[PDB]
Amino acid sequence: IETVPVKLKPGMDGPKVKQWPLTEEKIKALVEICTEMEKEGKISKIGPENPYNTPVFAIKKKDSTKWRKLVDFRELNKRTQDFWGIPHPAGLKKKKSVTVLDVGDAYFSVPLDEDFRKYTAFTIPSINNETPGIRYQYNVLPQGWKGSPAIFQSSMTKILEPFKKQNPDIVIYQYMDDLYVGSDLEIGQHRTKIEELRQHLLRWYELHPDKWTVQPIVLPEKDSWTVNDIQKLVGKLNWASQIYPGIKVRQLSKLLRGTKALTEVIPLTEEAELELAENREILKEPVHGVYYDPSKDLIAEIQKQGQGQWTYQIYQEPFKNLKTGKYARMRGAHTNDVKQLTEAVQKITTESIVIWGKTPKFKLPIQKETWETWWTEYWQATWIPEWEFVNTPPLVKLWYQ
Amino acid sequence: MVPISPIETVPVKLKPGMDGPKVKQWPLTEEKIKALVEICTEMEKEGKISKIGPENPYNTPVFAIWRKLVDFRELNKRTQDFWEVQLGIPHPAGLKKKKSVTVLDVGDAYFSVPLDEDFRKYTAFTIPSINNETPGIRYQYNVLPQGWKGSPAIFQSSMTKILEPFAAQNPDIVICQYMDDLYVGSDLEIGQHRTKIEELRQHLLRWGLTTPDKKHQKEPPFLWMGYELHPDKWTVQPIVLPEKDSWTVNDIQKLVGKLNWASQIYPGIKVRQLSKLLRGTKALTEVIPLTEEAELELAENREILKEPVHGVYYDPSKDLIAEIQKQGQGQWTYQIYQEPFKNLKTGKYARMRGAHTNDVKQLTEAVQKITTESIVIWGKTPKFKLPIQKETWETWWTEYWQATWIPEWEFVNTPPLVKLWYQLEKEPIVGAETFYVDGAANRETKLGKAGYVTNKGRQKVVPLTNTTNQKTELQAIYLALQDSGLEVNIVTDSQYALGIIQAQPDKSESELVNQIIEQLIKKEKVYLAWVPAHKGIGGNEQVDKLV
Numbered sequence: 011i012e013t014v015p016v017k018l019k020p021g022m023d024g025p026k027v028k029q030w031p032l033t034e035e036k037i038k039a040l041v042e043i044c045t046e047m048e049k050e051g052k053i054s055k056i057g058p059e060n061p062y063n064t065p066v067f068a069i070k071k072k073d074s075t076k077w078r079k080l081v082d083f084r085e086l087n088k089r090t091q092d093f094w095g096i097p098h099p100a101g102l103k104k105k106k107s108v109t110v111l112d113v114g115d116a117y118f119s120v121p122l123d124e125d126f127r128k129y130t131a132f133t134i135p136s137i138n139n140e141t142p143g144i145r146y147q148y149n150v151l152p153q154g155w156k157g158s159p160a161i162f163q164s165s166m167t168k169i170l171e172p173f174k175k176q177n178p179d180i181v182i183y184q185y186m187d188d189l190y191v192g193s194d195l196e197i198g199q200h201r202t203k204i205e206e207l208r209q210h211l212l213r214w215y216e217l218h219p220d221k222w223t224v225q226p227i228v229l230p231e232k233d234s235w236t237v238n239d240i241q242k243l244v245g246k247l248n249w250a251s252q253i254y255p256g257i258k259v260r261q262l263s264k265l266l267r268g269t270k271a272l273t274e275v276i277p278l279t280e281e282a283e284l285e286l287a288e289n290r291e292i293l294k295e296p297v298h299g300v301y302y303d304p305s306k307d308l309i310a311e312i313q314k315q316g317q318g319q320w321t322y323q324i325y326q327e328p329f330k331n332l333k334t335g336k337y338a339r340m341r342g343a344h345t346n347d348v349k350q351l352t353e354a355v356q357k358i359t360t361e362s363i364v365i366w367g368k369t370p371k372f373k374l375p376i377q378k379e380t381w382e383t384w385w386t387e388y389w390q391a392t393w394i395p396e397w398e399f400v401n402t403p404p405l406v407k408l409w410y411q
Numbered sequence: 412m413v414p415i416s417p418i419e420t421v422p423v424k425l426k427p428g429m430d431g432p433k434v435k436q437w438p439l440t441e442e443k444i445k446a447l448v449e450i451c452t453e454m455e456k457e458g459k460i461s462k463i464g465p466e467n468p469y470n471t472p473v474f475a476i477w478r479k480l481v482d483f484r485e486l487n488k489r490t491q492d493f494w495e496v497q498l499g500i501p502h503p504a505g506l507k508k509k510k511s512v513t514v515l516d517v518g519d520a521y522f523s524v525p526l527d528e529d530f531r532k533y534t535a536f537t538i539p540s541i542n543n544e545t546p547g548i549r550y551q552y553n554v555l556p557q558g559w560k561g562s563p564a565i566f567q568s569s570m571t572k573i574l575e576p577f578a579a580q581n582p583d584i585v586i587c588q589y590m591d592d593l594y595v596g597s598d599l600e601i602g603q604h605r606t607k608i609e610e611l612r613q614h615l616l617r618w619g620l621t622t623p624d625k626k627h628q629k630e631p632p633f634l635w636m637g638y639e640l641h642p643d644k645w646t647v648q649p650i651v652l653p654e655k656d657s658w659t660v661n662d663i664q665k666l667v668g669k670l671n672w673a674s675q676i677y678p679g680i681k682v683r684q685l686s687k688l689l690r691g692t693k694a695l696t697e698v699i700p701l702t703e704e705a706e707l708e709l710a711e712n713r714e715i716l717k718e719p720v721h722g723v724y725y726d727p728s729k730d731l732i733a734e735i736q737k738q739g740q741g742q743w744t745y746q747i748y749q750e751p752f753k754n755l756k757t758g759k760y761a762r763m764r765g766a767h768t769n770d771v772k773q774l775t776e777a778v779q780k781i782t783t784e785s786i787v788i789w790g791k792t793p794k795f796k797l798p799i800q801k802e803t804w805e806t807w808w809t810e811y812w813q814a815t816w817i818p819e820w821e822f823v824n825t826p827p828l829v830k831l832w833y834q835l836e837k838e839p840i841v842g843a844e845t846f847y848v849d850g851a852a853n854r855e856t857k858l859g860k861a862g863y864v865t866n867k868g869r870q871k872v873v874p875l876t877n878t879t880n881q882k883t884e885l886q887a888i889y890l891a892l893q894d895s896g897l898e899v900n901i902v903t904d905s906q907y908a909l910g911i912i913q914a915q916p917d918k919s920e921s922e923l924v925n926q927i928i929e930q931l932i933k934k935e936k937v938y939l940a941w942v943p944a945h946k947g948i949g950g951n952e953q954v955d956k957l958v
């Protein structure tokens with residue numbers, strides 16, 4: 011009910027990001043939504059004296075046919091002054107189950123600083139640039155802006171105070187427009203508790219991190235090895251020697267002495283079996299000197315394995331994986347690689363939000379034009395991470411398979 | 412007097428930290444001074460400008476060419492940034508046919524919209540005195556000056572705010588704004604249409620805006636931004652390829668301008684060679700002799716541009732189709748239509764700058780471009796007709812290491828077809844010879860060796876001059892492909908070669924890679940295995956090629 015002064019970083023102007031083209035149905039949905047919001051004072055039309063712009067598009071979240079308005083506040087977020095912080099709940103990832111709630115509506119009841127509103131300007135585009143685009147700016151806290159959870163933090167604390175005092179065993183976290191609630195109850199008791207918290211928030215996504223673990227490097231167990239089998243084993247071991255110090259491959263390479271056919275079976279000498287066993291024992295241990303640095307960026311690499319299978323690694327230093335995983339879920343994307351990749355990016359970003367409380371920078375195995383043409387068609391989250399595009403096929407694809 | 416409704420002013424500031432312009436007035440002839448005094452006198456009598464005292468410290472130079480020409484370049488440098496709404500003109504192919512279309516040009520466009528009073532002091536300009544024996548006559552603008560940075564944007568936004576209720580209460584007509592002209596279109600009867608045009612002229616007159624009292628001097632066909640707009644069709648303004656004894660750089664850039672512009676409706680326009688002659692020239696007067704490829708391409712262009720071709724307007728009730736054809740050398744051409752032989756528009760796509768490529772990637776990129784253009788123009792993705800079998804695309808995207816996707820499409824058998832030229836095996840081949848390859852080179856003398864040793868005792872080492880490590884690894888694989896049967900396993904330690912071949916190109920810059928591709932196409936089964944170098948892997952003989 012009282013506006014808090016908000017400014018930008020020193021020496022940085024407002025965001026001036028080009029609005030990309032939208033389909034007719036998305037434009038109509040944004041016109042209807044923005045008309046309804048304008049009738050409610052959440053946004054207001056602006057004149058040509060506002061040179062700033064932030065992209066806007068429309069999505070349809072899970073289990074809903076109603077269109078939702080999504081604003082790509084990435085530039086405004088990186089240009090907005092740093093708000094200060096709450097230490098990340100290191101026990102949120104430890105809890106057995108976590109449920110994600112959309113608390114974006116609660117942001118619209120708090121007015122936005124008057125002098126900052128011109129920086130939230132967005133444009134509903136028109137087909138074929140026939141008529142001018144409909145320009146709006148926000149009067150309240152917008153969804154997607156990083157200052158909205160920072161300003162609403164006090165109000166959220168006051169609303170969640172009785173529930174947190176009532177259940178000290180329930181962990182509550184907040185990131186952007188999302189509220190992550192972790193506990194160890196039963197799925198039914200968890201759903202009833204979530205309905206309790208949602209009506210508690212009213213009068214004012216099953217996720218199980220315990221069923222997630224870090225993945226080790228595994229080697230084949232064979233009774234008969236071919237030349238090709240041993241060659242691949244030596245390649246994977248030489249790759250793993252960049253991560254684990256004690257990996258030794260000379261006794262296995264000793265078997266490849268001589269030009270033999272790739273399909274020829276080779277028996278393992280005793281020294282080779284001993285070497286392979288030592289390498290297994292070394293791989294069973296965790297990585298030496300792997301820590302998290304909050305001042306550094308998180309990097310996520312994704313490899314396409316085929317048959318709807320995808321592998322990923324979150325790290326900060328090369329060969330120092332903080333997390334590794336294998337997303338193979340099939341949900342109406344069997345014939346679309348881009349939809350699979352987008353759901354993978356969303357899931358990995360959610361895991362990163364749970365573990366560290368921030369999103370990683372992705373390295374996507376896709377061409378820039380394809381991804382930038384189709385990724386908004388399958389996006390269902392309220393945040394957007396940063397990404398880059400790898401155009402050279404990495405050799406380490408099958409070593410994560 | 413009927414009360415004219417006021418137009419809300421747009422608050423305007425200068426850039427942060429900057430001040431208004433202060434430029435010295437130029438000395439003018441007595442004739443020019445008299446002319447400017449008369450013009451400014453009439454304008455003051457109309458209310459566009461006003462006399463100001465000596466307190467105003469800002470000044471902008473003025474000229475007479477009589478007509479007054481105020482040079483606002485300094486104030487434009489010092490004026491804030493505006494939201495320019497004119498970025499990318501509407502494409503004629505996106506318009507929808509209307510039974511009646513009327514044009515209304517607004518007289519005194521900028522000189523009818525008021526300027527922010529707190530900003531008028533920055534528009535000050537002085538008229539010099541005769542012999543400069545008196546202080547010059549000082550004026551400031553009360554309306555949007557023609558040539559000022561914020562005149563088009565403020566004019567457009569004010570006109571939009573005025574036209575909003577009329578467009579709301581008249582959904583059966585469409586209105587379009589462009590500079591000082593409005594285009595209204597409707598499917599009503601000509602009487603009802605002219606009636607609603609009269610209502611629009613009245614509604615604009617309620618704000619003090621004058622429309623053509625005469626019949627509008629613009630009638631079909633309309634010549635607009637290089638386009639011809641007709642009642643039932645559209646095209647480009649006539650494209651004439653001239654006959655030249657010798658072609659210079661400016662003639663070739665004119666030719667590629669006319670061809671690039673004409674390619675959006677004339678199908679099959681190619682510009683690869685004519686624009687290839689401009690590679691790294693940077694000299695406007697340099698005469699470049701035309702290659703025979705460019706002359707034959709120009710002959711095909713003259714054959715396509717022989718007789719006029721037109722495009723139709725958009726019908727939202729019919730499906731939107733886009734058909735693609737390969738033209739060779741990285742050139743692609745596409746037609747977008749809704750009925751056969753009646754194109755909405757056409758275009759082309761040239762491959763990006765790359766060292767390796769294949770046809771499936773280029774076709775994908777072209778599909779993405781066409782998709783973006785269609786969403787811009789029509790607001791929807793068209794259904795595609797592509798020269799590629801369904802099974803080819805399925806093998807490609809299922810085996811490609813990258814994620815890739817094409818929207819809804821169907822196969823059209825219009826050669827040349829896009830195909831996969833080779834597929835590498837997933838597992839080693841039983842009964843096929845195993846070639847262990849390697850290559851090495853000396854960094855100083857540029858001398859190297861490339862060769863292989865096989866499980867059957869076959870060997871080869873070839874010496875090479877003026878080579879590198881990468882060249883000798885590729886050359887080693889090439890030798891293994893040369894001297895092996897229809898099925899072959901190949902073992903290499905070159906991460907470079909594996910990085911090239913796993914990208915699956917069918918055409919490359921390096922003639923060595925192209926030869927490798929030509930060898931792969933002839934094979935039945937090829938399995939390419941990689942091992943680490945210098946790890947004592949027998950068979951992989953690094954010392955055999957370092958002698």
Ligand SMILES: COC(=O)Cc1cc(Oc2ccccc2OCCn2ccc(=O)[nH]c2=O)c(C)c2cc(C#N)ccc12
Pocket residue numbers: 140500501506507508509510512513514585586587588589594595596597629631633634635640641642643724
């Ligand atoms: C922003 O406006 C545009 O760019 C589109 C635009 C639309 C326009 O006309 C229209 C106005 C409103 C709705 C549809 C319109 O064109 C439909 C297709 N068409 C076109 C011409 C014709 O006879 N008969 C037709 O059925 C006109 C007459 C324009 C005239 C000029 C000129 N000089 C420039 C642009 C124009």
